[PDB]
Amino acid sequence: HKTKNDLPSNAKSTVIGILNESLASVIDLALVTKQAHWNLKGPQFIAVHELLDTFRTQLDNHGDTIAERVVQLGGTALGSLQAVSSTTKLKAYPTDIYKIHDHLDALIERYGEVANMIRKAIDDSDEAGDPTTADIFTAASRDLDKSLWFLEAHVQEKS
Amino acid sequence: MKTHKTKNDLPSNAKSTVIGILNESLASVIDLALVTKQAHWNLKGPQFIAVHELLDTFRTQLDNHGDTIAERVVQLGGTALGSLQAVSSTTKLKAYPTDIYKIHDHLDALIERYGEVANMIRKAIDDSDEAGDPTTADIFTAASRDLDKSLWFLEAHVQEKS
Amino acid sequence: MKTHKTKNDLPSNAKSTVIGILNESLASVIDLALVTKQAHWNLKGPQFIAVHELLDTFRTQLDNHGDTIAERVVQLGGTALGSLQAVSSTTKLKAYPTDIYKIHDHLDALIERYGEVANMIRKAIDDSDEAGDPTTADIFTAASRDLDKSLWFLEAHVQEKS
Amino acid sequence: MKTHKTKNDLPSNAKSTVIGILNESLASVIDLALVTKQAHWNLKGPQFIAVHELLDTFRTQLDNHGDTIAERVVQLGGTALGSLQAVSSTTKLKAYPTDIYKIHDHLDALIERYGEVANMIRKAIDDSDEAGDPTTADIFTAASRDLDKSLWFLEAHVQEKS
Amino acid sequence: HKTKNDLPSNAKSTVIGILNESLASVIDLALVTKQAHWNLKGPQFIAVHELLDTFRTQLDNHGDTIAERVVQLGGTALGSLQAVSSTTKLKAYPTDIYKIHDHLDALIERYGEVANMIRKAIDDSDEAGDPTTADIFTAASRDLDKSLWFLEAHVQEKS
Amino acid sequence: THKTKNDLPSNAKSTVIGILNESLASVIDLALVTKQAHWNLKGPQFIAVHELLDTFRTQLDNHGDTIAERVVQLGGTALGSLQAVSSTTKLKAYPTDIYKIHDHLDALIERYGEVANMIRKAIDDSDEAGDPTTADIFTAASRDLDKSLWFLEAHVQEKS
Amino acid sequence: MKTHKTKNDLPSNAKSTVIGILNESLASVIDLALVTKQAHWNLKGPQFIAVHELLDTFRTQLDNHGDTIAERVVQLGGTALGSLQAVSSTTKLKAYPTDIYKIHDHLDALIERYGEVANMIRKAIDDSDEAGDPTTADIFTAASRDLDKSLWFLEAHVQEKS
Amino acid sequence: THKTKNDLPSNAKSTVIGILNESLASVIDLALVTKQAHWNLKGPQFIAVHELLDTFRTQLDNHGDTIAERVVQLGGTALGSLQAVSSTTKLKAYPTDIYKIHDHLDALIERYGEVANMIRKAIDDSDEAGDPTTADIFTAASRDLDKSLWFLEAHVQEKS
Amino acid sequence: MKTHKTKNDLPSNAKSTVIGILNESLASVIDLALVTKQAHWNLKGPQFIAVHELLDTFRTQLDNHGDTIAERVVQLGGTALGSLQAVSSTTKLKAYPTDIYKIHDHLDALIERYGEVANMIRKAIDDSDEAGDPTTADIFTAASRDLDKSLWFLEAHVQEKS
Amino acid sequence: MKTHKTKNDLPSNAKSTVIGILNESLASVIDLALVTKQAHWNLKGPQFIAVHELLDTFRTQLDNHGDTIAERVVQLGGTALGSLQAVSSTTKLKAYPTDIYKIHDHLDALIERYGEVANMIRKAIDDSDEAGDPTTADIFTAASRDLDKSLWFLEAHVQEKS
Amino acid sequence: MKTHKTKNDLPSNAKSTVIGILNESLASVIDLALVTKQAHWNLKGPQFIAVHELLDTFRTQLDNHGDTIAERVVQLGGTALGSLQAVSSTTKLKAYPTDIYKIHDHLDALIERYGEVANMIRKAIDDSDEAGDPTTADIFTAASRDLDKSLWFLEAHVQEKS
Amino acid sequence: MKTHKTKNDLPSNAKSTVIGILNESLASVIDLALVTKQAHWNLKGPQFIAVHELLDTFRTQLDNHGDTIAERVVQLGGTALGSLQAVSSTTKLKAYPTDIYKIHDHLDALIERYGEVANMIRKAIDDSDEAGDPTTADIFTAASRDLDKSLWFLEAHVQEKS
Ligand SMILES: [Fe+3]
Ligand SMILES: [Fe+3]
Ligand SMILES: [Fe+3]
Ligand SMILES: [Fe+3]
Ligand SMILES: [Fe+3]
Ligand SMILES: [Fe+3]
Ligand SMILES: [Fe+3]
Ligand SMILES: [Fe+3]
Ligand SMILES: [Fe+3]
Ligand SMILES: [Fe+3]
Ligand SMILES: [Fe+3]
Ligand SMILES: [Fe+3]
């Protein structure tokens, strides 16, 4: 499949791997956010339940932008169940936790991991000579870092 | 209270039966709507604004299902009974306490009443279908989906303490 | 029930007086909201759809003014009293007839009750202002504007026959 | 015509039965949609604007139910039959009078046709459920809820004369 | 975790399994719909690309309704990457197809499987004495059967 | 001087300005009439007729503004003040002592029918002066005025 | 049927002529609206979704132009004739085939029928202007713009094969 | 008879009807004035002043309707026809031969200031008659009229 | 380029004539849209923001009329000619100055070009109607209404100095 | 600074008095707007998201009441004083702590400051009415309604601990 | 063409360099916008409506980026050059063929030009950053994201044939 | 104050550097937001309405950028400093004059302050990038694009005098 897009061939290759790696952990994190959303229980239920839906919409939008960029560079976006299981960097989410603080701890671990993977991806994409992909990761980084603060702010003090 | 003439051909015996089921449910749904605002105004505690605002969503839903149920009484040739006196004589809910304020207090009182109305509407689906009115049973099924979801949102605030 | 501490500095005797005015008005406004839907569902006659739909706009208005009155009770450190039992013990409205159907019969019944509530709210403006609480008086003035317009809409339907 | 292959695993005998029920209902729902606009344009009398406008809301609902019924035929591998000739050969409604103008005369003509289509769709829910197709029965149940309410809105204009 | 919801205990158990089984295949199908959306190529690209986004929104809405019902009945909704991999009934989606007809064939297989699983779930949920859950599956069935027709209509004739 | 590059001939401009300012005065009076009736009608169809007349008033506001703006595009002065309308309207004074809905409908039907018919003539007179753009403004107004006249007459054309 | 009195002063002979033009065009526009949905449900082939959705846009436009044409008949004192029997007796379109599925086959059948209604409406503009009714000719000119654009959209799918 | 359950005393009703119908006539004239200026103004600030005056006209339409509806709630007849407005307005005839923006702003400032000041007095006279609900209608109108008068005067209060 | 076959029955010589009128107008409308943005970006002076924003509304209008004119060419079986090279060979507008900045200088330059295009479109109405195509004439009349209003808006800024 | 001439006829002594009241209140409202965002960004604890989002609603309300107060100063011929230096010189609020994070600590600090501005505005209503300016007293009454409701929303999070 | 004075402190050498980069890109983006509509009007073939409508989304995007690029020229003290003559002298695109109709023909011509502009804007990001203007580089980066996505949407229609 | 723990792995020295840059910028952006409204209320002259309205659009943008900058401080574990006292101690803007009214005098005062804040944020992009924080540099880049356009809109009102 040819493309007129003239980003260098080795920059395309490099950046497609960065993209598809991040895609898998973003899709996993999208699944995790709904898993916590459905099963959380405790005094702050409705506010955290609803917040997690806004995070899921953001993850859906950044995972679509990342996958569409793979394809613009001539690759294959890899977001099926099997590609995500083989490529995700996140540990399996616990399916036997319910308390809000337990889900906040588990989400903070994973949100922090994805936020920091995307932070790295900005630099790696820019250094590869693709500032257009680096801006896709920068936009994702701004939402991931804000979502990470929102979650951490719930546990940084007890009252 | 005159029976009204209509081309709707649901049998007369099914109409009478389901009108009773509807009006009974209507009274407890109106009382539950009043209860929901009573709690909403008077709740106090650390989760005030989120619980306050959630209760207004519930009240809109109870207004919509109470209206669909009352309209169905009239479609079947009956009289919808939703005045203050009808609600007082027919509601199945215990009087709501007017001297509670803590959020957890209101949540326990709301869960009692939401669970009673949720379960009443779950029975009304089966009773309406068995009386031979699946259109009325579908009205109650839509109400049951929102009452079971609302009962879950209330209970999930107290099922764990952290 | 218990009084709540607040930084709001309206004098305590003014708070006590105006909470009584607001809770009294709240019970009749909630009863009038129930009456509005009772008529909405059961009226029948040549202008059915227009009058049926108009009454839904009136019910939304009553819901918004009832909410603003109740919230004001609580801002002044009181307990808003809007449960079925509080409304039944405090409403000034006569029980609404459940055996009427003609539009003109509902209009008469509604005009009587809308008039009573419009005039109650009119007096509440003045009583609130004399107690030194123009903020509460403005809540009642906003409600009075809507109640007097709604009363006019109802009466204009029966003031002429053609 | 011809049967189209689908992965949809509703049994073939149930598909054939329910396609017949859906296309039969589609023809009377399309005729009723044309009837609704025929009456809407030609209404004359004191109740004109509200009845004229209400009939457009009913037309939009009949368009949406008729589209849902037709799409279900095709989902099951059939051919939806909604052309002028299919509707003429399959409708159960008597020709609408083109020489009536008084609103009461259109209301009675509409009540007869709306009653027939409401009651046809009421039976379609049970026939579809008996065939083992609750998905199609739900399409007819949603239609029934709007037909029964529309029938009540029509009849409520003539059940009382004031 | 108690609930006032009085559906019988054995109906709750039965229906939670039906729900969580369907949840896994619906989430897998949601992933598949975006995998095809990103990678399809051919003359009908934009129309099929855009249609698949509407299907994904529908699957997101029915998977949320199914998962929230599990929890209303006192269960645990199971939608993490690992729960979906262990419970999905769909075969791995091919990651090396691009032609629109290849993706339509693969989506038709999977949409047909999920549509037919949900059709069964209506009956099983109703027979268990839970018409409120059966209506959740009925609403999903109407969208799955329409989406299945939309996909099949593209291949039922060649012009 | 209201010098413009618009090349419609100067005599056509002056002819069409007069047609537009005459219609503007009767449209503004009819807009005042519509609210006068709206506020004071009483009877069984009150809310439906009350709300309908507000839709008619918005339409008259939009056509009156399009007619006035066209006068100014053609180099004229739009004449829509209270005194201009009193000296140019063709409508008879609306009665201020009627309340029954049927009495307002008869009074509105007379005045709506006069304005609808003046606008119908204005299409042809503007086209015949060689200004089909102004004729289109009046055609758009005639479609609304004729529809509004039918909605009013439909209420009185049969007794029930 | 009967003619209704109106203050509208279009001359009586022009009213009679244009009512005939309007009711004639109304019948073919309503039949084209039915055809457009018939094709839409039963289309099969690679450009399914785009053509299916486009035909829904065309049906909304035909609904709005048919309503504008009908409403003009009544403004001029006539009776709008849009029932199933009136459409059957007056339509100029040939019966739409119910056994075609391929999208190119629906496109050819739609192009024949849209071309006929576009050319009928083009002629209606000049016949209405000849009768001295530019207001009615504008209704038809608005319809002609949408019909000629919709005919080009259909024909542009078949004028080239790649 | 316009018998109502509204219990404002009959003498207060008649006093406040007169205040409302007097203000209604000057508000309707000012709404006509606002469009008269809007159509015919010419000069460097054309589009901004042209569009602002449409916002003012919508506000006058809404206050005039609230004032008229209050007359009828109190058992009166709202008087807003062309002839009622000509016999009751307090505004001087607007000039039809002015075009410069500064000339329209001066003419509008005179008339906006008169209506703003009549409405200011109407608040107190309605409250003193024992009708704070009608006083609130005039207070809402005064807030818009005083803001509109400031927007007009701000254009002329400094030269640049 | 080549002629396209269509069912549209406007006579072939009329089609040919009106395609020439439409393509000629299209080139000057596209050049005027470019000129409108050139002025929008570069104007400077005391009424900058109001005039800058107004020109964006004019550009959207020119875009919509340019699109309607071009689409009409193609409906009549022609080829719409809107590329940079077609516009350069067919525009009637003089090159816009790139070294002006004062608002009054841009207004003068725009008034000249808006006047030329408004007057071209005015003549196109008549030429289209004389060729027997009132549908195309109505496209030009809609554009003329917007062009004559936009010309007035521009000229009203310079017709007085205060 | 300088006073500007206006046709507004509120007496000159009333204008001077109310301009002082307005500018005084403007300074404390702008400082409260800054405080509300200071707390919002730095809140930490279990009810983070609900309190964070609620404070944004309060900031929009303070922006709209501060703008209405400032605009009234200028309507009366004065100079609105809302710059950083004017706020610093005129605010009645104590400096907000920048080293607090726990949500209960921000709630106590916000309650002190919202209570002060609510009570200042309550007094401003009566001082404006005493000066003979009911139009200005209405601006402050509208602000008082939102300040008293926002103060209750803050205090209701701390009046009970569960 | 005068240089305009501004407080913006980007160095003069960077301003001059980036103004040239912007104006060059502006000319090819305007030509590409014209090309996009040229194709949109004249395309014919089986995927007509989907491709026709997609091209209008592209044209809106090119209008938005062309505007942001031209505005940045002026912010840096330059003259935006977007007239017909400037575009003709500066565009890098070959003249678009006016005698092609097949969708695949238009797609190949569009992909050539979209690829040239996409690649020009990709270079402009780096050239603007290296000239020391990351704010301008961000304008080009936003444009590059939409041009690369649009180039992909065009190429994905021809990268496979089924 | 104190540092909050976060999983955010931007190096600690980069976090400290960039928190200083963000809080310094926040104080001048808040002061500029207050300046913008100070000028907006007190403008007098022929250009009043369009300048008054434009300044509210700039205020909304400064609110949104200032919120984004403050939130980034907290994301990095810092304390956002936006209270009246922090702004007074940290702003780089000279006090805005309260005794100017002519629009040209406010435009020059605004141009000075907007220029200073545009140029401060331009340097913040490069300082943040030098610290290894492109996420924070993008926040300042988005702010820069709106500050530079707002500065050009202000300066374009005074760069020419006609
Ligand atoms: Fe996408
Ligand atoms: Fe209802
Ligand atoms: Fe509330
Ligand atoms: Fe459909
Ligand atoms: Fe959910
Ligand atoms: Fe206008
Ligand atoms: Fe209609
Ligand atoms: Fe009104
Ligand atoms: Fe187009
Ligand atoms: Fe303001
Ligand atoms: Fe722009
Ligand atoms: Fe924020």
Side-chain angles (χ1 to χ4, degrees), chain F residues 105-121:
Chain F
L105 288 175
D106 281 344
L108 292 163
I109 288 165
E110 163 183 315
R111 288 166 181 78
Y112 271 72
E114 283 164 354
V115 176
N117 294 333
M118 288 174 35
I119 292 299
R120 192 186 331 291
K121 175 173 172 204

mmCIF file of all heavy atoms in Angstrom, chain F residues 105-121:
data_model
loop_
_atom_site.group_PDB
_atom_site.id
_atom_site.type_symbol
_atom_site.label_atom_id
_atom_site.label_comp_id
_atom_site.label_asym_id
_atom_site.label_seq_id
_atom_site.Cartn_x
_atom_site.Cartn_y
_atom_site.Cartn_z
ATOM 1 N N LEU F 105 -60.803 36.728 16.127
ATOM 2 C CA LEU F 105 -60.531 36.081 14.845
ATOM 3 C C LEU F 105 -61.156 36.816 13.686
ATOM 4 O O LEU F 105 -60.504 37.006 12.646
ATOM 5 C CB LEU F 105 -61.126 34.647 14.863
ATOM 6 C CG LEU F 105 -60.335 33.672 15.765
ATOM 7 C CD1 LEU F 105 -61.068 32.325 15.811
ATOM 8 C CD2 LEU F 105 -58.928 33.431 15.201
ATOM 9 N N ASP F 106 -62.374 37.322 13.821
ATOM 10 C CA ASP F 106 -62.949 38.092 12.694
ATOM 11 C C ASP F 106 -62.184 39.379 12.396
ATOM 12 O O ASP F 106 -61.945 39.686 11.210
ATOM 13 C CB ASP F 106 -64.401 38.429 13.091
ATOM 14 C CG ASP F 106 -65.372 37.273 12.891
ATOM 15 O OD1 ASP F 106 -65.121 36.281 12.200
ATOM 16 O OD2 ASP F 106 -66.456 37.436 13.521
ATOM 17 N N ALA F 107 -61.765 40.057 13.456
ATOM 18 C CA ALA F 107 -60.996 41.289 13.246
ATOM 19 C C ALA F 107 -59.630 41.004 12.650
ATOM 20 O O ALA F 107 -59.119 41.761 11.777
ATOM 21 C CB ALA F 107 -60.858 42.085 14.545
ATOM 22 N N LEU F 108 -58.997 39.931 13.123
ATOM 23 C CA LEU F 108 -57.699 39.552 12.519
ATOM 24 C C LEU F 108 -57.861 39.076 11.089
ATOM 25 O O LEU F 108 -56.973 39.370 10.252
ATOM 26 C CB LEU F 108 -57.099 38.416 13.371
ATOM 27 C CG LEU F 108 -56.657 38.807 14.798
ATOM 28 C CD1 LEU F 108 -56.474 37.568 15.662
ATOM 29 C CD2 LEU F 108 -55.307 39.526 14.677
ATOM 30 N N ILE F 109 -58.877 38.308 10.773
ATOM 31 C CA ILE F 109 -59.081 37.852 9.393
ATOM 32 C C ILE F 109 -59.254 39.036 8.445
ATOM 33 O O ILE F 109 -58.629 39.035 7.372
ATOM 34 C CB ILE F 109 -60.266 36.855 9.329
ATOM 35 C CG1 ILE F 109 -59.841 35.545 9.971
ATOM 36 C CG2 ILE F 109 -60.721 36.636 7.890
ATOM 37 C CD1 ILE F 109 -61.040 34.640 10.296
ATOM 38 N N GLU F 110 -59.957 40.098 8.835
ATOM 39 C CA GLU F 110 -60.109 41.232 7.930
ATOM 40 C C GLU F 110 -58.732 41.826 7.622
ATOM 41 O O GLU F 110 -58.416 42.166 6.485
ATOM 42 C CB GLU F 110 -60.982 42.296 8.613
ATOM 43 C CG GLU F 110 -60.916 43.708 8.004
ATOM 44 C CD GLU F 110 -61.750 44.685 8.801
ATOM 45 O OE1 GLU F 110 -62.899 44.269 9.133
ATOM 46 O OE2 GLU F 110 -61.312 45.849 9.063
ATOM 47 N N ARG F 111 -57.918 42.006 8.669
ATOM 48 C CA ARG F 111 -56.650 42.738 8.527
ATOM 49 C C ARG F 111 -55.547 41.893 7.922
ATOM 50 O O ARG F 111 -54.792 42.337 7.029
ATOM 51 C CB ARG F 111 -56.280 43.302 9.905
ATOM 52 C CG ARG F 111 -57.212 44.469 10.274
ATOM 53 C CD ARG F 111 -57.111 44.817 11.753
ATOM 54 N NE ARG F 111 -58.019 45.923 12.077
ATOM 55 C CZ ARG F 111 -59.321 45.758 12.245
ATOM 56 N NH1 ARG F 111 -59.882 44.567 12.182
ATOM 57 N NH2 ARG F 111 -60.065 46.876 12.485
ATOM 58 N N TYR F 112 -55.504 40.625 8.269
ATOM 59 C CA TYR F 112 -54.585 39.682 7.637
ATOM 60 C C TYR F 112 -54.892 39.528 6.154
ATOM 61 O O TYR F 112 -54.038 39.469 5.271
ATOM 62 C CB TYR F 112 -54.536 38.254 8.293
ATOM 63 C CG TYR F 112 -53.515 38.196 9.397
ATOM 64 C CD1 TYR F 112 -53.706 38.825 10.608
ATOM 65 C CD2 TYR F 112 -52.336 37.455 9.193
ATOM 66 C CE1 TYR F 112 -52.776 38.808 11.653
ATOM 67 C CE2 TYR F 112 -51.413 37.416 10.239
ATOM 68 C CZ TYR F 112 -51.648 38.063 11.431
ATOM 69 O OH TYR F 112 -50.664 38.048 12.422
ATOM 70 N N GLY F 113 -56.204 39.495 5.848
ATOM 71 C CA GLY F 113 -56.600 39.365 4.420
ATOM 72 C C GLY F 113 -56.210 40.649 3.677
ATOM 73 O O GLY F 113 -55.665 40.501 2.581
ATOM 74 N N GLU F 114 -56.334 41.812 4.272
ATOM 75 C CA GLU F 114 -55.938 43.025 3.526
ATOM 76 C C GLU F 114 -54.433 43.046 3.307
ATOM 77 O O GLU F 114 -53.952 43.400 2.212
ATOM 78 C CB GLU F 114 -56.407 44.229 4.355
ATOM 79 C CG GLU F 114 -57.924 44.372 4.156
ATOM 80 C CD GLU F 114 -58.581 45.259 5.180
ATOM 81 O OE1 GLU F 114 -57.910 45.704 6.150
ATOM 82 O OE2 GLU F 114 -59.820 45.459 5.036
ATOM 83 N N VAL F 115 -53.688 42.694 4.369
ATOM 84 C CA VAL F 115 -52.202 42.713 4.169
ATOM 85 C C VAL F 115 -51.738 41.645 3.229
ATOM 86 O O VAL F 115 -50.879 41.839 2.347
ATOM 87 C CB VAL F 115 -51.490 42.607 5.553
ATOM 88 C CG1 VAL F 115 -49.950 42.535 5.348
ATOM 89 C CG2 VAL F 115 -51.770 43.856 6.422
ATOM 90 N N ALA F 116 -52.308 40.436 3.318
ATOM 91 C CA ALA F 116 -51.952 39.362 2.381
ATOM 92 C C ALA F 116 -52.210 39.769 0.950
ATOM 93 O O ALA F 116 -51.400 39.587 0.035
ATOM 94 C CB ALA F 116 -52.747 38.090 2.685
ATOM 95 N N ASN F 117 -53.360 40.477 0.735
ATOM 96 C CA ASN F 117 -53.676 40.916 -0.641
ATOM 97 C C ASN F 117 -52.816 42.100 -1.083
ATOM 98 O O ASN F 117 -52.488 42.083 -2.304
ATOM 99 C CB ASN F 117 -55.184 41.177 -0.730
ATOM 100 C CG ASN F 117 -55.973 39.884 -0.548
ATOM 101 O OD1 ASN F 117 -55.530 38.804 -0.826
ATOM 102 N ND2 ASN F 117 -57.200 40.097 -0.068
ATOM 103 N N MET F 118 -52.404 42.972 -0.179
ATOM 104 C CA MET F 118 -51.508 44.065 -0.605
ATOM 105 C C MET F 118 -50.151 43.479 -0.978
ATOM 106 O O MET F 118 -49.532 43.884 -1.978
ATOM 107 C CB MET F 118 -51.318 44.997 0.547
ATOM 108 C CG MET F 118 -52.446 45.900 0.983
ATOM 109 S SD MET F 118 -52.032 46.768 2.479
ATOM 110 C CE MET F 118 -50.186 47.010 2.123
ATOM 111 N N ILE F 119 -49.676 42.508 -0.170
ATOM 112 C CA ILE F 119 -48.377 41.892 -0.522
ATOM 113 C C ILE F 119 -48.420 41.138 -1.814
ATOM 114 O O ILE F 119 -47.471 41.143 -2.626
ATOM 115 C CB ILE F 119 -47.955 41.019 0.678
ATOM 116 C CG1 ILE F 119 -47.616 41.910 1.864
ATOM 117 C CG2 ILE F 119 -46.742 40.135 0.379
ATOM 118 C CD1 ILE F 119 -46.521 42.933 1.851
ATOM 119 N N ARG F 120 -49.529 40.430 -2.158
ATOM 120 C CA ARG F 120 -49.720 39.724 -3.406
ATOM 121 C C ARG F 120 -49.588 40.703 -4.583
ATOM 122 O O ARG F 120 -48.891 40.342 -5.556
ATOM 123 C CB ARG F 120 -51.108 39.055 -3.382
ATOM 124 C CG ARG F 120 -51.451 38.040 -4.453
ATOM 125 C CD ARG F 120 -52.908 37.491 -4.487
ATOM 126 N NE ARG F 120 -53.522 37.481 -3.147
ATOM 127 C CZ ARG F 120 -53.077 36.621 -2.211
ATOM 128 N NH1 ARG F 120 -52.165 35.693 -2.475
ATOM 129 N NH2 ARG F 120 -53.517 36.720 -0.954
ATOM 130 N N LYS F 121 -50.206 41.860 -4.459
ATOM 131 C CA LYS F 121 -50.105 42.866 -5.535
ATOM 132 C C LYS F 121 -48.659 43.392 -5.599
ATOM 133 O O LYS F 121 -48.164 43.618 -6.689
ATOM 134 C CB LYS F 121 -51.056 44.022 -5.234
ATOM 135 C CG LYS F 121 -50.993 45.212 -6.169
ATOM 136 C CD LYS F 121 -52.097 46.261 -5.917
ATOM 137 C CE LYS F 121 -51.784 47.512 -6.790
ATOM 138 N NZ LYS F 121 -52.454 48.679 -6.137
#
